[PDB]
Amino acid sequence: NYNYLYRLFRKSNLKPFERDISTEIYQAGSTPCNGVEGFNCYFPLQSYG
Amino acid sequence: YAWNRKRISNCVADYSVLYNSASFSTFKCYGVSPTKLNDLCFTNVYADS
Numbered sequence: 823n824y825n826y827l828y829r830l831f832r833k834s835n836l837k838p839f840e841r842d843i844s845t846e847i848y849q850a851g852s853t854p855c856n857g858v859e860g861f862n863c864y865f866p867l868q869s870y871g
Numbered sequence: 872y873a874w875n876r877k878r879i880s881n882c883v884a885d886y887s888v889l890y891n892s893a894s895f896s897t898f899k900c901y902g903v904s905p906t907k908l909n910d911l912c913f914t915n916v917y918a919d920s
């Protein structure tokens with residue numbers, strides 16, 4: 823049931839009672855992120871097996 | 872099987888030019904933080920290369 827998703831990491835810290843739908847990854851390690859986004863950008867969201 | 876244990880620690884692990892070099896692989900590490908390595912000193916870290 824991969825329809826349930828969770829975020830890998832968020833640049834900013836937590837925050838009470840708010841929702842964030844950011845679809846971009848940070849400048850991570852090797853292959854941080856092409857330009858701003860696109861290829862070689864680890865999806866900041868992951869599913870559940 | 873006989874990986875090394877040399878205690879490369881209590882030193883300065885600068886990475887400014889290290890990150891600048893594109894041929895380099897990965898030093899933006901996940902232990903405590905990717906960049907907590909320039910002036911950070913290591914307790915008893917043993918190299919196991």
Ligand SMILES: *[C@@H]1O[C@H](CO)[C@@H](O[C@@H]2O[C@H](CO)[C@@H](O)[C@H](O)[C@H]2NC(C)=O)[C@H](O)[C@H]1NC(C)=O
Pocket residue numbers: 888889890891892893894895896
């Ligand atoms: C050991 O090999 C590494 C990898 O080439 C060297 O690390 C680079 O050193 C140069 C300067 O000497 C820097 O510009 C690079 O940023 C470093 N990282 C790379 C190329 O990925 C290192 O200098 C070498 N050290 C010795 C004693 O030979």
